[PDB]
Design a binder for this molecule. Structure first.
Ligand SMILES: [Ca+2]
Ligand SMILES: [Ca+2]
Ligand SMILES: [Ca+2]
Ligand SMILES: [Ca+2]
Length: 397
């Protein structure tokens, strides 16, 4: 099927631009008034059987001790988590593997960091109360900040956890993040150790309640300990949280067929075939789709996924951002936005002339018959056009 592969390539390009235009990282900034930092970010929780539950986080951290700390320039953390189960464990539990790296400062170490050069034991204790449903969680494992690596197992010590495990991941030690060499002066978290910091958040679950958390993170002997209280209010008993409607298992697939699909979209951008995407190349493709980014906007889009800070999107960086984009689910607003890239006139239907316009602009030399074949592959009800629902099915993996 040459039609379905043209949909895939084009769809992945639109999806790539979507990711580049989104803010998916953990954004950190100095909070001078508190001698610390604040942060904001959003988490996408896959809903079982379809859709996304958004969780908007606001965070602030303040040192526990009076020693000097590092106040960072603006930057972000980028995370990769894998949730699993221990087959021998009968209690309600979560096994967590996590890698976290700082970035967001283009190219061109505190005493506290010394405590993190090797493997450090971790303890986590959480008491929670969500809509009056109380619970406790205890966790243990270790952190290896050299690689930004955490391995932890958590148990609900009160029996059944009344909220989905994924909703507690962000609450359950950012001092283990890997900061690159050129960003070591921006690592507040380690700079506050061993005395530690207080971390507070409010977490807004869209169309549902919110969590309020306060935690003390500090060394107790040789162990890095995170002690947390969590209070949730305003939840719907039958919502995605209290109703346990969120996926547990990390959907970190990535067939080699999918990686190949990603590479095809990569090469639409990488038109000189040197294995990296520049602002110039990104701008070219966006304009072809009817957009008009400034140079500053293009730099910012690249910076959002530019792991090594060299100002371009390298092939491995592109694979990484696309993996994240496919792992997580897009919102209805985001999908409709992609739909509108094709549905130029906004009547709810992608016509042959509209599809032709897009493919032609992307430099895809396609005959009028080829376009027709594309429409047909997607045209479910047979009306000779592609409606939202049919577009969605073409875009879903
Ligand atoms: Ca290139
Ligand atoms: Ca790069
Ligand atoms: Ca239309
Ligand atoms: Ca149709």
């Amino acid at each position: 099927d040459s039609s379905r592969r043209k949909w895939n390539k084009t769809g992945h390009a639109v999806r790539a631009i979507g990711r580049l235009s989104s803010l998916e990282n953990v954004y950190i900034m100095a909070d001078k008034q508190k001698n610390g930092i604040k942060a904001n970010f959003k988490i996408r929780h896959n809903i079982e059987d379809g859709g996304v539950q958004l969780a908007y986080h606001y965070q602030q951290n303040t040192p526990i001790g009076d020693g000097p700390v590092l106040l960072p320039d603006n930057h972000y953390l980028s995370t990769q988590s894998k949730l699993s189960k221990d087959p021998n464990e009968k209690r309600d539990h979560m096994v967590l593997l996590e890698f976290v790296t700082a970035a967001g400062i283009t190219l061109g170490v505190s005493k506290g960091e010394e405590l993190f050069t090797g493997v450090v034991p971790i303890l986590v204790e959480l008491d929670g109360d969500v809509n009056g449903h109380k619970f406790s969680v205890s966790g243990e494992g270790e952190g290896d900040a050299t690689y930004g690596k955490l391995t932890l197992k958590f148990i609900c010590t009160t029996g059944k956890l009344p909220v989905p495990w994924p909703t507690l991941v962000t609450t359950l030690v950012q001092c283990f993040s890997r900061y690159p060499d050129h960003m070591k002066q921006h690592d507040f978290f380690k700079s506050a150790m061993p005395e530690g910091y207080i971390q507070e958040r409010t977490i807004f679950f869209k169309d549902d309640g919110n969590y309020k958390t306060r935690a003390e993170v500090k060394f107790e002997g040789d162990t890095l300990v995170n002690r947390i209280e969590l209070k949730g209010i305003d939840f719907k008993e039958d919502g995605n949280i209290l109703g346990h409607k969120l996926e547990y298992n990390t959907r970190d697939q990535l067939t080699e067929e999918q990686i190949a699909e990603f590479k095809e979209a990569f090469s639409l951008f990488d038109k000189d075939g040197d294995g990296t995407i520049t602002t110039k190349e990104l701008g070219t493709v966006m304009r072809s789709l009817g957009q008009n980014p400034t140079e500053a906007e293009l730099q910012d889009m690249i910076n959002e996924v530019d792991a090594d800070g060299n100002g371009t999107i390298d092939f491995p960086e592109f694979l990484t951002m696309m993996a994240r984009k496919m792992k997580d689910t897009d919102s209805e607003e985001e999908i409709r936005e992609a739909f509108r890239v094709f549905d130029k006139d906004g009547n709810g239907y992608i016509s042959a002339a509209e599809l032709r316009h897009v493919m032609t602009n992307l430099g895809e030399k396609l005959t009028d018959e080829e376009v027709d074949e594309m429409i047909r592959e997607a045209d479910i009800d047979g009306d000779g056009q592609v409606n939202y629902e049919e577009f969605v099915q073409m875009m879903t993996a």
